[PDB]
Amino acid sequence: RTRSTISTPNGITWYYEQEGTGPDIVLVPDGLGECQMFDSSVSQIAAQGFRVTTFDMPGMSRSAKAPAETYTEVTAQKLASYVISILDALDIKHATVWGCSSGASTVVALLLGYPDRIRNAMCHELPTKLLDHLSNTAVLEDEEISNILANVMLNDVSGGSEAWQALGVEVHARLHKNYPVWARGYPRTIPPSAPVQDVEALRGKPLDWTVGAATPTESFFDNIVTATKAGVNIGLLPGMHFPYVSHPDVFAKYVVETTQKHLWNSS
Amino acid sequence: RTRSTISTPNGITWYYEQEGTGPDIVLVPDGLGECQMFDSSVSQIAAQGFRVTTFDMPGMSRSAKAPAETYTEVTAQKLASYVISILDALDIKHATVWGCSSGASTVVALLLGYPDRIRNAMCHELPTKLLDHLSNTAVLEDEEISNILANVMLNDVSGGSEAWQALGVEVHARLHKNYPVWARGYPRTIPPSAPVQDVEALRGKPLDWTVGAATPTESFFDNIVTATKAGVNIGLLPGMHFPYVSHPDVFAKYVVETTQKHLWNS
Ligand SMILES: C[C@H](O)CCCC(=O)CCC/C=C/c1cc(O)cc(O)c1
Ligand SMILES: C[C@H](O)CCCC(=O)CCC/C=C/c1cc(O)cc(O)c1
Ligand SMILES: [K+]
Ligand SMILES: [K+]
């Protein structure tokens, strides 16, 4: 596996990883922007004959050398433009993309905005509603935010506490630093940017949508309704918000099978 | 509150309760068939100007005087025929109906099969898939079934353990006896009988569908997809499988507001 950095003309110095040869599959992180969450799955996916690329998101973890605009007032459309910039830098012309949460918003924006570049998109648990309890963390002190959100991740949405904790001290130290960046930059502006207001724009698109099997029905109820209205494939993965952490083998199998489905349909 | 019995010519002697005067609202129990789960909500709903009727289901609790065919190999269509029989016996000509679980299958079967009798139906968490872990309890001894399912209700699907416990010792003593009846008669036959084969049959019907907000997404994921395909109103109630137990006030408000919406549309 390649582990390196690359700078794009928008001022972001990205940390990225890449493994394998074959059609491109790109794994976009969730809002916490931490790509070591994909470590196990990257190898499993690449071994099936794909070139797999992932990266820390701007302002987060090892991609923290970035202009303030890239991690404040963040929207799906901003993130999509940034992901296109690193795909350009890495000479990735066509890609299958995965994303969860703000990453889900991002990959739908990618598919809609850059259809020539995106083979197909997998979106998971895409936030479309403002949640005051999350937005309100943005005015707390840094260490208060990190303590609160570390707790929320572990206890409310990890979908697997043992796997979450087993990410280990190095990863959780980076996440600890990311929580205030995410809190101040994402929850107030990501949900209104959700690229799902136009159901007819989604119809017929190479989009596969998932929600966590154990996720409380209310959390992404709206995803299931919207996908069904648009005739978009909608299904479940085990766990909750982080299937690539809680169930990396099942996650990898899903990404591989879904990419293979669209490679067939393309031909 | 009227608490009484009535015998229908299919051999069932029903225990039923009624309160209030006005348009009829009928509360069909879940598979456990125990109508004291509606106690709080019956009074709240009736107070808003409705005649509310509920009953224990055949073979369950105080409606246990019933032929074996009414609580074995149970289907939505059988249950709907039984509910129509007690509505006939109580001279309830037009009704709003609520049902959860097998009760949900029942009220959708009622709406489709007896459109002239049903003003509107509210269905909650309608089972459409066989679950082997539930079906398999049918072959266990009575006491093991009761122990297993009492635990499942309390800890997994009540949506509110304190409220579940607060049903009280007499209710849980009745449920204790119902669990093996439900296990042997329901899980292997209720899901395949789900009246949701034909989405076009549901389109335009006065149906309001809910799932519990805290219910794991996978449990009734299919409900949300089917309702949306059919253009049916689909939404959430607080809690999980027993909103009338866990959140009786919110439940009653929902039943009242939904009935009022359809009385206006009428
Ligand atoms: C991993 C995730 O991308 C960031 C941590 C927050 C979290 O997991 C809560 C559950 C999912 C919510 C996402 C969400 C919810 C909002 O209201 C606004 C927003 O920008 C994102
Ligand atoms: C209260 C409920 O009506 C009877 C107790 C079982 C339970 O609550 C488990 C969760 C909901 C499942 C209902 C269900 C599931 C099946 O596979 C088959 C079936 O006939 C009913
Ligand atoms: K796994
Ligand atoms: K309540």
Side-chain angles (χ1 to χ4, degrees), chain A residues 97-137:
Chain A
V97 294
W98 155 278
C100 171
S101 215
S102 57
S105 312
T106 299
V107 299
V108 177
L110 281 168
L111 175 59
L112 294 182
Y114 312 83
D116 53 310
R117 303 294 297 279
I118 305 304
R119 176 182 301 112
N120 64 286
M122 286 158 282
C123 57
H124 187 81
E125 296 199 343
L126 197 161
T128 65
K129 299 186 192 304
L130 290 168
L131 300 178
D132 291 337
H133 71 281
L134 291 176
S135 299
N136 288 337
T137 63

Side-chain angles (χ1 to χ4, degrees), chain A residues 43-72:
Chain A
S43 289
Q44 297 187 57
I45 297 162
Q48 296 300 311
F50 297 101
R51 182 168 66 182
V52 183
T53 301
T54 192
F55 32 79
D56 292 343
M57 291 297 272
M60 308 297 183
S61 296
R62 298 152 292 189
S63 293
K65 187 180 180 175
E69 175 174 352
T70 69
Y71 54 83
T72 56

Side-chain angles (χ1 to χ4, degrees), chain B residues 7 21 30 42 45 79 82 107 123 130 136 169 175 226 247 255:
Chain B
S7 292
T21 63
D30 52 84
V42 166
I45 298 163
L79 292 183
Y82 306 150
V107 299
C123 57
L130 290 169
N136 282 334
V169 294
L175 292 179
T226 295
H247 298 80
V255 169

Side-chain angles (χ1 to χ4, degrees), chain A residues 30-32 101 127 129 131 134 153 157 182 186-187 190-191 241-242:
Chain A
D30 52 81
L32 302 182
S101 215
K129 299 186 192 304
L131 300 178
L134 291 176
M153 295 312 108
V157 294
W182 178 86
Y186 279 62
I190 280 287
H241 206 52
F242 299 90

Side-chain angles (χ1 to χ4, degrees), chain A residues 212-213 215-218 221 224 234 236, chain B residues 212-213 215-218 224 234 236:
Chain A
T215 294
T217 294
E218 66 177 331
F221 174 88
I224 302 161
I234 176 75
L236 306 170
Chain B
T215 295
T217 295
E218 68 176 338
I224 304 170
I234 175 72
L236 304 174

Side-chain angles (χ1 to χ4, degrees), chain A residues 134-145:
Chain A
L134 291 176
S135 299
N136 288 337
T137 63
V139 302
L140 300 175
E141 293 177 350
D142 282 356
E143 286 302 325
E144 301 175 322
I145 295 171

